[PDB]
Amino acid sequence: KDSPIIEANGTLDELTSFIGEAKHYVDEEMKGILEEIQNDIYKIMGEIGSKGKIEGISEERIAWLLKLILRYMEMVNLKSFVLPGGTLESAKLDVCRTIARRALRKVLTVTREFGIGAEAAAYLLALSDLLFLLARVIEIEQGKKLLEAARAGQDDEVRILMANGADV
Amino acid sequence: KDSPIIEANGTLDELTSFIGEAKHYVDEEMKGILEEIQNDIYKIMGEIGSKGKIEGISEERIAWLLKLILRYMEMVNLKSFVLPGGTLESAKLDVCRTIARRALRKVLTVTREFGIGAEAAAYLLALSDLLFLLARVIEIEQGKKLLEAARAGQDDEVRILMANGADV
Amino acid sequence: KDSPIIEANGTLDELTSFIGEAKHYVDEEMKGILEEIQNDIYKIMGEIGSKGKIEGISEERIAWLLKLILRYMEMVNLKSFVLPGGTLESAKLDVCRTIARRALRKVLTVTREFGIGAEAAAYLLALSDLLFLLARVIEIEQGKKLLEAARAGQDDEVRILMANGADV
Amino acid sequence: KDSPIIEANGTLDELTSFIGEAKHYVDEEMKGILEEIQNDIYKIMGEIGSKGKIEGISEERIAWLLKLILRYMEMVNLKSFVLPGGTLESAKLDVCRTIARRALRKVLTVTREFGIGAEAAAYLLALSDLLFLLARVIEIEQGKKLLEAARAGQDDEVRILMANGADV
Amino acid sequence: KDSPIIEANGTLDELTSFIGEAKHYVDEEMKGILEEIQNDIYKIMGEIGSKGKIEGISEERIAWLLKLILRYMEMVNLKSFVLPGGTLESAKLDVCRTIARRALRKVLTVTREFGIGAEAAAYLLALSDLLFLLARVIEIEQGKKLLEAARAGQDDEVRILMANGADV
Amino acid sequence: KDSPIIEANGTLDELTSFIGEAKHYVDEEMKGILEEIQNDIYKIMGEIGSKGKIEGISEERIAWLLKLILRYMEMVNLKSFVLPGGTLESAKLDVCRTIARRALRKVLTVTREFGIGAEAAAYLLALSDLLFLLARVIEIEQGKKLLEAARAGQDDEVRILMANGADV
Amino acid sequence: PHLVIEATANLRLETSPGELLEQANKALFASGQFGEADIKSRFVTLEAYRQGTAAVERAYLHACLSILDGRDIATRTLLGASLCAVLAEAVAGGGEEGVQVSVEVREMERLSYAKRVV
Amino acid sequence: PHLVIEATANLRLETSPGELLEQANKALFASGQFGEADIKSRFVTLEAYRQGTAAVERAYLHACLSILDGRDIATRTLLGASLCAVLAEAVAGGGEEGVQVSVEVREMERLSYAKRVV
Amino acid sequence: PHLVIEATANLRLETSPGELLEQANKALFASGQFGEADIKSRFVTLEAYRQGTAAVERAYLHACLSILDGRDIATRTLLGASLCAVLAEAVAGGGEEGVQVSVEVREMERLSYAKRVV
Amino acid sequence: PHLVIEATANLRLETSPGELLEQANKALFASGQFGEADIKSRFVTLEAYRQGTAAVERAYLHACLSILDGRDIATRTLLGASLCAVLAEAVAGGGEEGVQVSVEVREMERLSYAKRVV
Amino acid sequence: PHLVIEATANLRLETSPGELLEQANKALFASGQFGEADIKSRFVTLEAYRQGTAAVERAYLHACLSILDGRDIATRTLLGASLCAVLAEAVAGGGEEGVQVSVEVREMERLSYAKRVV
Amino acid sequence: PHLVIEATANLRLETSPGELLEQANKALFASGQFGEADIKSRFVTLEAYRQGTAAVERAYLHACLSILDGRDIATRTLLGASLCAVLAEAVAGGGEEGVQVSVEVREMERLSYAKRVV
């Protein structure tokens, strides 16, 4: 009922609605990842809304995020300051990253006054580093679809990829 | 010109832009409902921006929302904690519900300092209970389109519904 | 590391992600405009995050926005209070206008305490007057596509425009 | 760990030690009452020290105090302002009444800041009205032991009662 | 009903209950002194609880305390730092002295905010110098009972005095 | 002369008067322990009342308390939540433990504002763990007096122990 | 939540006094704030009544909803506006001019409120 | 403004229960705070009642005036003192000793108060 | 102190409605807060009532004790808990399931409260 | 960032003590907070150790990560939870019951911290 | 609680280095603050050491007890004074003058502290 | 003041590990803050160590000076900068690139610090 509690629950309810919108543009593998993140934000909202009287996420869940981050960090070859939204599908996940940074700043105010949710704010910090890596993978497998279309000798099927934002 | 007035007008202008984006995915009946909500948020913005010197919405408008809520509450059979965004069309309306909860917290700060907009904050509270019920109807008539496709003996037309998020 | 600095950088990172999502629905001319705005928000984020120790945007950039605004103000014939989101493409740019008004209120708090970013807040004020004019152009060339389809004698190609929100 | 919590637990631990000292001067009936009060102060200390996360006393316990108060109020015929400590045994219970009034003022500060322990402060208010009535009974059955010793024709056994404070 | 008023009345009610417990261990002369002190604390509690609207003790009462202090100061030959509680009877009056010093600090807070009870705080200051002198008399007439038992040639009656704390 | 200094000296003078009352019910061994504690509280009162300009207790004294606690912790076999005051003699030492917890909270306020008396507050914390162990020893040697009276074949001498609170 | 509805004697309702309370309990439960079995309603008709000082024959209707405290002003304004639309659609008329329908929402204190189930 | 007057059954009034409400509405309108048609009064008689624990036969009278908030304590004290002089001049007597007349002025909340005219 | 006890019509009490008020006045006087002749109680039975939206037959009991302000929350919580134990020991039963008994303690304002003795 | 890992002598690791530090430096660099060459780790084995007062044979593992100050509690909680998952996946076992793995994150002061490159 | 005891090489103890840690764990458990199996101790001997600038041969002993935060200064002062009396009764001597024994109590942060049981 | 110097195994010093501590104790005593016999230093060499994630052979040096609290930031910055100039003039080199030397100054708490002389 307090003022930083209803703001932190309002942004975490805003973040899990943007993930549910952005999980329809990704493939079948990343949809299973984003549907398990949506369950974990629901566990954080029960912990923060009850001021710690209900148990939240375990440390097993943060060990599941960081084992995904160490998997996708090998595929993403880092580059210079690239603009958000190369393709349309990777533009939806760059929005959910910036809601998770806003939800992290609200949970950090609950921690600095009520002393609860320090394991919850460590989940939203590891989440927004995964949504950055998840967005950079989709731009790559869209771009590796361009090099196979250049070698296949296609006239129309190569330019529909460039109209969706495939890098050259 | 005051500080809680420009924040409350900024979120109500943000809410009526998300409704205008989400009214292109719904059918012809729900588009007429969402276009009349957009006119009522414009009447609230004139009342709050002038600190009550211009008349706002009437109590006839809140009697129109609650007579819609009592109609859709019969079709929506309530269930457990379901994740937001079953289909793509019902994922856009779960975003507008969480902007209306954020716009309600800004109007509640105008009420607690200037004493205006108590009938406006009762509109945004009844609005976010309609956008929750409007999202749960679209998941149902998408799912009742699955049972008719199972009885029709279709091979391709049943799985394009499951690729859009129809419940099994 | 201060509290108004991380909020102003969080909303400017939120604004450049909504522009990267909304630049896939516009044509090839407006995509070049929106990709140059995304570079200028990246220059503002470096200036605000370093509290003015890094140079920001020049006054040449605000002279480029206002020379675009004076070009599109002639095509947009002003009318009454029209609802946001006539078409689907102009509904995405009415969302980015309301993030730029929220990012302007965060940069104005950095200016009123640290005295920096007054040329940055004059960019976000001229930006949200361009995104209003950019949204009203797309509704017009969608509507001028309706008058040519009425004179062409089309039965199916005129009503698919009206299903996308072309004005009559 | 807060400052009004450790003061309220320190006085409730002080009150249950004075009751354990004063239950050796009373008869076998009042010792069973005072040993059940000591269990209920232990339930209040668990509720206050955990800030309400552990369940406290039930409303069945306050219904047990007030059904004892309505029993002893018939025997105690009220009189003028009588001094505390008529006999030695009723002087020990007039000390425990004034610790229960001090413990009530500490629990009332926990209620006025943390909103917990309103059913606990209603127990300590009904307790200090029982310890006032329990002290006035012991002075009476000591004084009714004087009228039977006057009629028995005793010379030494009547004055040892007056040396212990029996009223004439 | 104010906060320093209910604390000052709670400690003065605590002090007159400790005097009523400690007046059963003293002889018949000191019991008449302690029963007249208990009436004067009852007059102070009526004055403080009504914020001065009821008349309190007169200056005749403080002239009665100081004429007792000047009588007992001749018998008490002062010595070094002796520990409290030489005998059991003089240990009960060293407790009531430290409640009267605590009651004096509560009445001094009523005086420093409401301007009342300056003649009441001068009674509790002269009281705690009498309870110090009353405790040192009982240790002396217990010790002068030892020198008469040494000259009487007693074997058992001298050591029961030393088991009660008679000084050698 | 300061306000937390006169409160801390008033409770330490209250604690050494309750120890002087409770040292007449214990045997000849525990009386020598309680008379040496009374000298150490007198050394703390000189240190706190002079704001550290007089030297207080040494660290040799806290090494004497903890070497007593490690001796009595072997005899006291710990059990469940037992009520304070099993016997009358162990009920007097459960009162002095709760004054030492109140005196510790006053000395901790002197430490948190004036920076003095951190070695004094470590004495009162080790003191209240000894007075808890001293109270549990007296209940045991009263209860081991019951098992020898059951084997001696006594009819009256076994029940006078049970009337004093010996455990069965 | 306790709902006391006080109508005058000359007020003609479109339904029974019992069917008015079933519509008012469904409109209180549909706000999602209260439990199902905790919504308790009662209807009182008045024999002796006066409205105003003029001699014209009038009628009125009044509901007083008492809820426990701890809810914001947006919830209490919605509860009064949802009930006032139920009572105003049940009034057929009475007297010689318009019927005045009004709903008060007041807050009971949560700490001193006792409750038992026999 | 709502005025609920609750008298016992053994209380004898000098007038009718209807003419008591006409005098109480003229004394509320003469304060200049309320409108004419917004002053709504009702009179309730009680069948089962007890006053005190003694066995002496007693009677009482009680009015509860509920006004909207936003008025200072000088206005609310005048409204209770103007009504208590009207009710005390209408009591002929009842019971075996004096009749106790009392008037409470309580404040409704203005933001959550709904009102319509059918 | 005014005590209004509102029971439904299907509620069966173990005693008379008059003997329930004698037990409630002795439990209010035994708290030592009020005078003897200032404790005024009344009992109201209800004809039209609904509890919940379900079709099961229910009954309830409700008391609203109105005292003057100036008392701490420990006194008001004890007054509601002392009255709720009196009413719950008088209910024999009613309806098809358990009876809900609840007691509200509300505070009248002391400055605007008028009182006279005719 | 300095990482001191202190294991007992009876603790059996699944890898070498050198390959444990390569996995702990990759999990510290993957947080994006530190530079590459500024992550310095060391592994210490203990000869004389006791855990608890009981006579059962136990083993433990402990890491103390010292970073410079200026980072929020969400960054320090993630650094302790990312390291505790690396050490717990390297422990094969030791003693007669479970191994306790714990990680402390402490903050060095930035103003008084000196640094040079020879 | 982690206890690191660092003695020099020339320091002669009255007992073994293992029996010193059993006495230090019993004196930490007897304060009633920590659990039984959570008290973890280790003993480190030093090969290269200097005390002071003079050429006289010296020895020292040092313990650093790291506990989690949330305890008042009376608890931390008692923990350092209970440990310093254990170490000082175990030193036989070393060097050419007196041995300096010192105990530091430092506070780990509770929010960023990770712990697991393999 | 306790000074713990932790060097790796591949680090070549220009002097002995014992003569490095004599130069570090003279540079701590020359600040005029500590006594002569209260400056206690120790040198620890490390067997298992990793710096960074790259495969290049590196070495480092680290000192942690723990002083009692109550000194301003100008005194603690001078103590870290006076020690970092002593250690950097003793490093001959090690590894395949530059040696990193760093000094941390941390504050022990004065109230809970125990000290004895056996």
From TrEMBL, chains G, H, I, J, K, L:
InterPro entries given in the database record: 5-COMe_2-OHmuconate_Isoase, Tautomerase/MIF_sf
Molecular function (Gene Ontology), one example: 5-carboxymethyl-2-hydroxymuconate delta-isomerase activity
Gene3D superfamilies for the chain: Macrophage Migration Inhibitory Factor
PANTHER family documented for this protein: 4-HYDROXYPHENYLACETATE CATABOLISM PROTEIN
Protein name: 5-carboxymethyl-2-hydroxymuconate isomerase
